[PDB]
Amino acid sequence: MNYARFITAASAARNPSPIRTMTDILSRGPKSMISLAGGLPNPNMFPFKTAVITVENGKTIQFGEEMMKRALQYSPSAGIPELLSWLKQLQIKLHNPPTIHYPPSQGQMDLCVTSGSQQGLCKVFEMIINPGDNVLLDEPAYSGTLQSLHPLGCNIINVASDESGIVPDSLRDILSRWKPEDAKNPQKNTPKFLYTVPNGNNPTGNSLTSERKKEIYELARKYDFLIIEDDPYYFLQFNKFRVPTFLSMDVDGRVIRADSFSKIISSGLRIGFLTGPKPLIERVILHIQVSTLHPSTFNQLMISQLLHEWGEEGFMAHVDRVIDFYSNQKDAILAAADKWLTGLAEWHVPAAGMFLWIKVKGINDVKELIEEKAVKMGVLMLPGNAFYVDSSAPSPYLRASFSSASPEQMDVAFQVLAQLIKESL
Amino acid sequence: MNYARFITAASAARNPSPIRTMTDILSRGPKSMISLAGGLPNPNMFPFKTAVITVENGKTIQFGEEMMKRALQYSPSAGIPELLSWLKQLQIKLHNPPTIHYPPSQGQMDLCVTSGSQQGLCKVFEMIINPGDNVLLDEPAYSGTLQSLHPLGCNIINVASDESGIVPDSLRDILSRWKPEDAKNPQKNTPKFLYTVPNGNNPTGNSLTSERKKEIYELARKYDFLIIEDDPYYFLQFNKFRVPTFLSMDVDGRVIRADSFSKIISSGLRIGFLTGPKPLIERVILHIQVSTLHPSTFNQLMISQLLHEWGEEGFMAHVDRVIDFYSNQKDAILAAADKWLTGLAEWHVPAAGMFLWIKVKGINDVKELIEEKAVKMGVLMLPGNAFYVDSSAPSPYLRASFSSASPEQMDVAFQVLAQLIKESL
Numbered sequence: 029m030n031y032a033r034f035i036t037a038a039s040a041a042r043n044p045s046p047i048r049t050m051t052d053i054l055s056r057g058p059k060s061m062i063s064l065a066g067g068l069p070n071p072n073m074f075p076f077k078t079a080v081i082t083v084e085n086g087k088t089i090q091f092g093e094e095m096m097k098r099a100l101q102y103s104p105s106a107g108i109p110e111l112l113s114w115l116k117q118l119q120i121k122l123h124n125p126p127t128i129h130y131p132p133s134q135g136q137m138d139l140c141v142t143s144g145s146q147q148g149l150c151k152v153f154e155m156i157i158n159p160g161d162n163v164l165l166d167e168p169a170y171s172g173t174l175q176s177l178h179p180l181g182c183n184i185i186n187v188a189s190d191e192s193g194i195v196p197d198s199l200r201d202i203l204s205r206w207k208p209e210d211a212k213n214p215q216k217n218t219p220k221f222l223y224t225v226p227n228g229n230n231p232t233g234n235s236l237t238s239e240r241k242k243e244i245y246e247l248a249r250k251y252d253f254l255i256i257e258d259d260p261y262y263f264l265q266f267n268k269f270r271v272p273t274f275l276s277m278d279v280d281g282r283v284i285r286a287d288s289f290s291k292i293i294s295s296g297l298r299i300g301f302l303t304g305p306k307p308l309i310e311r312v313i314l315h316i317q318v319s320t321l322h323p324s325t326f327n328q329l330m331i332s333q334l335l336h337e338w339g340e341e342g343f344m345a346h347v348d349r350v351i352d353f354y355s356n357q358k359d360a361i362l363a364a365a366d367k368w369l370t371g372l373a374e375w376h377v378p379a380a381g382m383f384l385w386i387k388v389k390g391i392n393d394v395k396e397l398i399e400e401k402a403v404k405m406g407v408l409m410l411p412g413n414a415f416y417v418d419s420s421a422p423s424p425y426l427r428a429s430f431s432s433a434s435p436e437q438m439d440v441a442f443q444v445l446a447q448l449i450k451e452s453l
Numbered sequence: 454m455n456y457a458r459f460i461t462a463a464s465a466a467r468n469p470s471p472i473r474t475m476t477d478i479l480s481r482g483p484k485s486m487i488s489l490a491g492g493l494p495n496p497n498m499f500p501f502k503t504a505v506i507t508v509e510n511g512k513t514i515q516f517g518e519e520m521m522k523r524a525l526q527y528s529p530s531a532g533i534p535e536l537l538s539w540l541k542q543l544q545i546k547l548h549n550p551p552t553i554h555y556p557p558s559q560g561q562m563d564l565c566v567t568s569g570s571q572q573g574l575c576k577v578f579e580m581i582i583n584p585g586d587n588v589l590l591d592e593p594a595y596s597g598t599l600q601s602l603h604p605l606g607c608n609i610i611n612v613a614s615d616e617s618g619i620v621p622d623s624l625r626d627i628l629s630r631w632k633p634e635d636a637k638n639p640q641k642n643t644p645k646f647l648y649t650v651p652n653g654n655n656p657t658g659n660s661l662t663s664e665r666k667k668e669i670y671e672l673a674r675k676y677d678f679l680i681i682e683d684d685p686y687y688f689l690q691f692n693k694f695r696v697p698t699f700l701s702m703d704v705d706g707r708v709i710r711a712d713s714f715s716k717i718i719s720s721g722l723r724i725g726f727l728t729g730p731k732p733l734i735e736r737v738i739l740h741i742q743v744s745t746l747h748p749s750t751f752n753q754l755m756i757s758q759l760l761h762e763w764g765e766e767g768f769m770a771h772v773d774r775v776i777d778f779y780s781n782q783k784d785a786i787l788a789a790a791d792k793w794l795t796g797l798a799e800w801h802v803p804a805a806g807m808f809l810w811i812k813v814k815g816i817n818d819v820k821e822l823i824e825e826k827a828v829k830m831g832v833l834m835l836p837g838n839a840f841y842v843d844s845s846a847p848s849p850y851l852r853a854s855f856s857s858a859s860p861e862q863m864d865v866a867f868q869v870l871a872q873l874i875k876e877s878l
């Protein structure tokens with residue numbers, strides 16, 4: 029509601045452009061209009077002339093001479109128009125955000141295409157965080173988030189989590205360090221935001237339940253903080269009934285949601301999207317206008333043409349088949365773990381995503397086991413140390429990926445693991 | 454020299470880690486090694502399967518099934534290795550920087566592929582600038598750089614410039630406010646860097662001479678500041694003997710150079726590169742790791758394959774052909790200005806790039822002429838105000854692009870402009 033408290037001095041200082049209100053006038057003028065105003069290079073000089081890209085379960089994508097010129101040329105900072113509209117309509121189909129028809133100043137849903145979702149998150153963190161600011165999140169947490177937040181000088185306040193994600197009673201008891209009003213009231217330092225991966229957390233694989241999401245949202249309004257819903261495994265939930273998102277219940281305009289195409293369509297193309305209140309999305313667009321300028325227009329066109337030919341049906345049909353693939357991988361890694369790990373280790377079943385989080389029994393830090401012993405036997409899993417704000421502290425946990433390994437190679441890795449565990453007790 | 458001076462506390466706090474020492478060992482291990490440690494999604498799920506991309510004056514680019522999987526997948530933060538090595542070899546050939554065989558901790562030349570050259574510039578600015586820092590540049594200057602620097606709260610000290618770029622007397626005189634020894638001491642705030650666009654300044658078209666470059670470099674050594682060489686029109690110099698770069702004379706390791714393929718190969722692909730002392734390139738790599746992660750690996754592969762097939766000879770031939778094109782546009786717009794505007798405005802012939810900078814004679818501010826009268830007559834040029842730190846001050850200057858317009862379009866636009874100038878005297 030007071031979006032100004034969640035916007036730094038540097039971020040508030042960002043301005044429009046200005047230049048291109050001019051080349052804007054060209055768009056709606058007569059076809060006889062001559063512009064010498066713009067700063068576009070001549071695309072006729074660019075060496076790539078046409079493209080044809082084959083698709084599985086889909087018609088081939090063709091860029092002809094005119095489309096190629098557009099693919100190779102500057103495009104709008106927030107994204108190409110057809111991809112922004114397709115994406116906004118998708119958010120409406122999926123989450124029907126309460127906020128879609130609110131006035132702009134009151135946090136009307138806006139959305140921008142980012143160069144990967146991580147771009148959206150980084151700009152968001154940069155938009156918000158003054159050193160000494162308090163932020164909430166559940167460890168274990170995505171190491172990219174922790175590495176992004178560290179140089180910002182926030183105090184990270186760990187919220188307790190279990191098989192079902194953040195524990196709302198833990199959140200409650202952290203927040204009683206303040207009362208609300210506190211928040212309407214600066215410089216106390218009531219938390220600016222709570223960040224979480226609600227579906228298939230990296231590294232734990234745990235997902236928030238809907239009931240718990242409702243409790244967290246209630247806390248968020250009470251202490252007036254932002255929720256940043258970083259949801260890159262949103263389209264990889266193994267339950268075919270997707271749990272309601274924070275964005276679907278954002279009646280206040282206090283959620284910022286990052287979505288990713290990195291797990292489902294392409295990670296290397298660097299295309300994600302950020303959804304949230306208009307005045308906050310506007311600040312990230314201005315920062316991108318001075319940094320990446322825009323996401324690859326070629327890559328947006330490839331995605332947008334794919335998405336439009338599929339329709340929301342072809343899109344959903346595709347996420348379904350990939351979930352089916354990851355769910356079989358999940359089953360196979362669970363079967364390997366049950367087989368070899370013994371009463372040797374404990375793990376929860378991943379509710380989404382692509383990682384298994386394994387607690388090794390009777391070993392207080394697993395870095396030697398993995399960095400030294402397992403590497404020598406040609407088997408790599410990831411120690412848990414990376415997923416904590418304090419990475420120097422001992423961790424008995426291992427992250428194991430199930431995205432790619434065959435059943436045979438999971439069987440070998442887990443028998444080797446079990447042996448070294450037993451050799452180390 | 455002392456790189457820590459030019460690195461923020463946020464920037465200095467960034468960490469490399471904490472995961473991909475695991476990808477490290479996998480590469481240089483046996484083929485029989487099994488990894489579950491990485492966070493790569495399965496590329497087989499991605500819907501694009503092959504690409505065929507035609508090239509003018511070139512052999513067609515083919516991404517078969519295996520190369521496409523690579524193109525759709527995460528890749529290293531600093532760029533794909535074949536593009537980095539091609540680009541570093543280019544810099545050696547073009548600029549032969551003194552710094553190439555220095556120890557890393559001293560200025561060893563390094564290079565980072567960025568998501569456009571403006572991404573690298575923006576992270577350099579972010580890496581260096583504390584609010585209140587002094588920084589040096591010539592006005593008029595690129596609007597995007599002015600819009601990037603403003604929110605960082607630095608003090609921009611304008612350095613005088615003429616037809617031949619920044620005037621070293623003006624720079625020398627500005628620096629006499631300090632003694633050279635004051636650089637050794639943070640609190641009295643000697644400038645952190647000099648920023649300039651040495652070839653075809655946007656909006657002016659003027660280029661630095663080789664002799665002024667040497668004097669400017671002498672000054673930078675004397676008062677120990679960095680030079681940031683933003684050189685996107687480096688490959689668009691009309692004089693076909695290219696003036697020596699700051700990078701080419703950089704015996705101290707104090708130059709950061711931004712190059713762009715935006716004007717010559719593709720703006721919409723968002724691929725540029727940043728060349729500079731290893732310690733500072735390293736700080737920008739780490740900021741990229743938490744923001745974009747890496748430039749699109751698809752678009753890097755397109756460019757790398759084009760470049761490798763062309764070789765250094767094919768690349769420079771292409772740059773010759775595009776130069777010849779922009780040179781002919783320059784001639785056509787100069788001819789139109791001479792035709793219509795003689796006695797009514799003054800301009801220098803552009804030495805590189807794509808802009809003509811026109812000072813109109815009897816009019817103190819060109820905003821009404823351009824924003825109101827010219828618009829109504831259907832011709833757009835860009836008012837000069839946008840290229841100054843204080844955009845609110847009157848400007849009698851106009852920027853006209855010659856990248857695209859036909860000679861007839863230029864004729865009619867300058868005929869209209871001339872008439873409106875005379876109606877406004």
Ligand SMILES: Cc1ncc(COP(=O)(O)O)c(CN)c1O
Pocket residue numbers: 143144145146147170172225229230258260287288289290295299300492746
């Ligand atoms: C929790 C989380 N958030 C964000 C990202 C980065 O996603 P993107 O590729 O869309 O930038 C990842 C990638 N592992 C992630 O696991």
Ligand SMILES: Cc1ncc(COP(=O)(O)O)c(CN)c1O
Pocket residue numbers: 067321568569570571572595597650654655683685712713714715720724725
């Ligand atoms: C002087 C200058 N610097 C930087 C840029 C941005 O270039 P890039 O597309 O490589 O990000 C431009 C764009 N014309 C420019 O004129």
Ligand SMILES: Nc1ccccc1C(=O)C[C@H](N)C(=O)O
Pocket residue numbers: 047048065066067068102103321596597655
């Ligand atoms: N950033 C852009 C986005 C779109 C189109 C052009 C540009 C530019 O590079 C700025 C141009 N040189 C200008 O000064 O109008």
Ligand SMILES: Nc1ccccc1C(=O)C[C@H](N)C(=O)O
Pocket residue numbers: 171172230472491492493527746
């Ligand atoms: N942050 C990265 C940097 C480089 C390459 C990939 C990534 C990731 O996508 C994170 C990965 N899934 C991980 O948690 O290890």
